[PDB]
Amino acid sequence: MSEESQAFQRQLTALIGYDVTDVSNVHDDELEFTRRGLVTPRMAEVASRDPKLYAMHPWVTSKPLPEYLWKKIANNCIFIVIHRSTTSQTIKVSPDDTPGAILQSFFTKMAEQDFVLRVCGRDEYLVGETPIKNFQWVRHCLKNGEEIHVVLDTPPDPALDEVRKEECDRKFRVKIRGIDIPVLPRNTDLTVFVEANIQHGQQVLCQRRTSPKPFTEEVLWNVWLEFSIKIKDLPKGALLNLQIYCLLYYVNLLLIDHRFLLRRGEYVLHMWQISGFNADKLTSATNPDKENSMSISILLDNHPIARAEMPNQLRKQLEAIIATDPLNPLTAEDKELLWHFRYESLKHPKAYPKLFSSVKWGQQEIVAKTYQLLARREVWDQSALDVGLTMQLLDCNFSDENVRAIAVQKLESLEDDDVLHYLLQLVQAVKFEPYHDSALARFLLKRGLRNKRIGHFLFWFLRSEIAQSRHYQQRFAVILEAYLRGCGTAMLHDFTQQVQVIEMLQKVTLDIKSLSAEKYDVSSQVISQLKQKLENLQNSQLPESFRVPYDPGLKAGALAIEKCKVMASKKKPLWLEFKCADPTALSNETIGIIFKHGDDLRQDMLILQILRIMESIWETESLDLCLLPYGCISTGDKIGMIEIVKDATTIAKIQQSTVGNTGAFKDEVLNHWLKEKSPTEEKFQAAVERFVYSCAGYCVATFVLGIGDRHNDNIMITETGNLFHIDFGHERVPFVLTPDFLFVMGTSGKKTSPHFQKFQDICVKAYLALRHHTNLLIILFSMMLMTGMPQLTSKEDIEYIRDALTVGKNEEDAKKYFLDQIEVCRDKGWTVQFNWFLHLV
């Protein structure tokens, strides 16, 4: 291994934020085995991808143009403005024209074909055989009433993407020797025992306990725990879960390894301490902190794997069971039905999750029958892809490799555009895979390496987790490294720039947070030191440019130091502004970015991404709710970026600017603000309309997600009328619809009006459009809770969304339910809003 290659691994380590060659925290070779296992999938995708299309990463969709976007084209014509160093002719185009085609109606229309169309000021290309109406940038421009400005230039050199070459029928038992912790002192000395569980898909096959003993820094049982399950019956993917109760600590050990071998020998496992149900509890990783953590010693001394028509009424029971929601509990009666009627069940793709939860995974013969069942998979294979269904089979309830692979098989058919929609949840779903190398992980690897946009986000989503999750960083690092080894030198250089930038801003963030207290109010002293420090960075270890992490097509240049500052809030986040490093840009507007330290931005990414999913869901229904899921990215431990939405203010600041002593609240302020920021009544009417739509979308989305009761300071609005929520980091009301919002709607004092009627109509339409996707929403909600929050009750917390989506009810009762919800806010008026500030005194 050349000295060059060692320097390279060093490079990857700094981009990843973890050393994948570190062997300090392992008890076997799973991780190394996986690094090697992933080489094949990587080389295969690299060798398979088209260098040209890969370099230009066109962003496209096969989906039809929504009704609400056809509205803006009734002339069957679209205008593209091409530019080239001086003047710019505006070509009239047909929505079906191909980029190379409009290049024919150009060159000849003017009068060598080795040129390509690129969006002005962006690293975005319109290429490939695709109708221009199928390009996302084109649809984004129409939806925003913006013109499509493009520049004619030379295709990027694929050479820049060069990738560096690479080079027994006995019952199961376990001996618990004892436990050891360096320091126990809490308050009162209690007693302690060890609980050993054998689990599969968060289902206990057998449970055993040790006798209680005095809790001292060292407790030695030296006791055999014999389980009812036979060795031969252990399913691959089963975990020996070990727990200490006084519940204090846990740790897991895969009973059958990545080689299909039964675990054997001595183990000293360092455990995880509970913070006083979630994905972290399922991890096969052990606590890396060997100095301050509890450990448990165990011994293993115990390779494997070597007609009749249904009556009308049972079938009805069966179909009823299948119709129930993902969260409906399956009775013992229900499971037996599903299993007995196995072959009938297999004819309904929607039964798959319920059927595989009916499997007795602790019985070799049954599992086998199950694999036999999966053999004739025709009905499933030809079924239309249902993302909600697929994700159900990737959650914590399925530990079987084969069950999860068919889920992954269905994902193979997603277009890149959809992958981007679900990417974050798919990455989080890697936490439910029992092995490091899995079909799900390889699919993400493959898709990321196939498309630059997916690779970029895949990188940040992985790095965010590597940086702040001890439970999963090892697995995610191996995945990221594999990816980094195939993305190409260009991407590598880009990621390097981005990582350098955020690292510098982190330093700065910290140093500046130090030069001030815990809030007040800053301090011209504090702002000046910031500007100096940035001036220092600017010249230079701070790279010429870098891609915006939440908007990779955008290249950020030099900081505009005069415009930077520290925001006035408890935490002291930076308000940074940069110049665009692309001369071809259509404006002088800077790139605003908020850099913040002290908060875990992962919950916000999760919420913002779900918001994006709701928008695409609504698109599948021809609806546009005008949400504004601003860019947000966890870039490392307790740090990240947030997009600064231009021309936007807080609803509270608007209130506050007019008196606002102790937080008095006037109904007409909002309407006045909008009218004053409008240059004309036209623009004002557009603002009001957009407000109605945006208000409706956020009321619905926020109710469903159970995040509806918010303080005014957590909700913003653009000067153009777009309302939107922010800060999703962790009497009552379902959502925020205050009298001022109502005032803009032309209503006041519980009355009606054309815009308000229009609002209720949009809400209801929005609400029921989401109910057609109930299962997708429920499964995303529950995964989000398991992988993104603290230790959430696996029933009651998750059950909220079921109630919220009013599962089980017909359309009439649903509309009713929501309309009453709208009434509650009205009756409550300003109460909850009003309650703030006082709680603090």
Ligand SMILES: CNC(=O)c1ccc2c(c1)OCCc1cc(C(=O)N(C)c3ccc(C(=O)N4CCN(C)CC4)cc3Cl)sc1-2
């Ligand atoms: C011209 N644009 C803006 O002023 C602006 C302000 C805030 C945001 C923005 C634009 O983009 C939209 C997304 C966004 C998201 C935010 C967020 O998540 N949090 C937690 C947040 C809330 C308040 C502040 C804050 O201190 N201030 C200073 C007072 N000012 C009136 C509001 C923002 C900072 C953050 Cl990061 S702030 C914010």
